[PDB]
Amino acid sequence: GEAPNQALLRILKETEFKKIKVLGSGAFGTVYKGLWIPEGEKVKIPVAIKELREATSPKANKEILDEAYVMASVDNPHVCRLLGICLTSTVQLIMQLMPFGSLLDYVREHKDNIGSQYLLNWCVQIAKGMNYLEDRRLVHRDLAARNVLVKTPQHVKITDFGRAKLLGAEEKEYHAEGGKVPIKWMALESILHRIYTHQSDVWSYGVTVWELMTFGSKPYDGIPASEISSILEKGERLPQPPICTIDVYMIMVKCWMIDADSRPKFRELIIEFSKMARDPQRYLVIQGDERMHEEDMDDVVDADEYLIPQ
Numbered sequence: 131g132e133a134p135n136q137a138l139l140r141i142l143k144e145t146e147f148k149k150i151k152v153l154g155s156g157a158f159g160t161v162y163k164g165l166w167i168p169e170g171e172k173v174k175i176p177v178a179i180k181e182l183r184e185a186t187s188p189k190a191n192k193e194i195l196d197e198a199y200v201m202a203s204v205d206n207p208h209v210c211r212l213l214g215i216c217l218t219s220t221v222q223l224i225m226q227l228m229p230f231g232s233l234l235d236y237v238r239e240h241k242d243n244i245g246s247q248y249l250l251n252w253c254v255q256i257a258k259g260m261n262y263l264e265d266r267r268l269v270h271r272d273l274a275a276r277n278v279l280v281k282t283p284q285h286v287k288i289t290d291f292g293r294a295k296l297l298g299a300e301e302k303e304y305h306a307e308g309g310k311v312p313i314k315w316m317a318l319e320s321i322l323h324r325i326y327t328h329q330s331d332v333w334s335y336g337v338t339v340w341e342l343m344t345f346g347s348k349p350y351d352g353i354p355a356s357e358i359s360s361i362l363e364k365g366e367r368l369p370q371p372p373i374c375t376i377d378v379y380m381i382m383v384k385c386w387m388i389d390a391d392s393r394p395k396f397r398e399l400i401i402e403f404s405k406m407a408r409d410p411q412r413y414l415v416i417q418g419d420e421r422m423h424e425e426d427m428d429d430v431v432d433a434d435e436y437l438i439p440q
């Protein structure tokens with residue numbers, strides 16, 4: 131068959147884990163900082179428990195089990211893995227705790243400490259992430275700095291799959307009927323024709339690198355998504371960030387070509403940032419770059435990514 135997804139889907143017990151703090155809430159629901167302690171096993175694993183809402187019909191069309199489906203499949207150092215699922219009325223998605231938050235938040239808080247080695251490496255890690263998804267014929271459809279999580283300052287993972295759509299053997303594009311949308315991140319091709327390819331993902335990767343090099347700005351700030359379509363059409367793009375050479379800028383700008391076959395492929399993006407991250411400062415002029423590189427109760431018997439290899 132066209133790749134029998136012989137993945138596994140683990141079922142867990144709301145008893146063998148304890149919530150500890152709300153990390154956030156949107157319309158979707160709530161994610162809690164949590165502790166998972168599989169019975170028997172002498173391990174305690176830090177987790178995020180993502181609880182959502184029901185409805186009069188939307189609760190029973192795969193409220194998230196779609197997401198649990200895509201995340202149940204992916205295995206890659208730079209993509210969030212779903213540890214398991216919880217079959218309470220509001221099914222819980224159990225996930226590895228990314229203990230440093232979203233990157234968008236992170237770069238803001240630490241601007242005057244982020245180095246160029248760091249920025250370029252998150253650039254390399256996210257392309258590696260996205261390239262895995264392209265391997266698995268997956269289209270993230272919502273790549274942004276907010277949706278990249280921080281495990282360590284030297285290890286990030288792509289993180290939100292509410293909108294992820296797997297392509298079928300004869301599908302070069304997807305066509306999302308509608309809903310709300312993150313306009314200032316989407317390829318022009320998308321913003322007009324609901325068409326999403328891996329290459330519209332590259333457009334998003336572009337805004338993401340931009341978010342990263344502005345230490346967390348908002349793209350087209352001020353401007354309302356209402357007319358992003360219009361300014362983009364006449365030819366405007368996001369500015370060159372002050373820390374960026376032509377080299378880094380010419381890259382983001384390529385991700386924003388109007389012909390999407392004319393944008394870079396993730397496989398190439400990692401080759402390029404890879405090269406930059408060896409001589410980081412030919413490429414990122416960061417003032418003083420040079421002098422630049424939980425609430426744990428009782429732990430002891432703990433683990434994390436290293437249990438997921440059960």
Ligand SMILES: COc1cc(N2CCN(C)CC2)c([N+](=O)[O-])cc1Nc1ncc(Cl)c(Nc2ccccc2P(C)(C)=O)n1
Pocket residue numbers: 153154155161163177178180210225226227228229230231232235276277279289290424
């Ligand atoms: C250290 O604990 C966290 C804290 C923080 N915040 C909030 C508290 N303070 C402000 C610090 C910043 C974040 N966050 O979002 O910035 C993440 C983690 N860790 C984590 N691990 C796995 C996951 Cl799945 C997940 N999802 C998560 C958590 C909250 C909000 C939205 C999401 P999402 C859209 C990707 O589903 N979060």
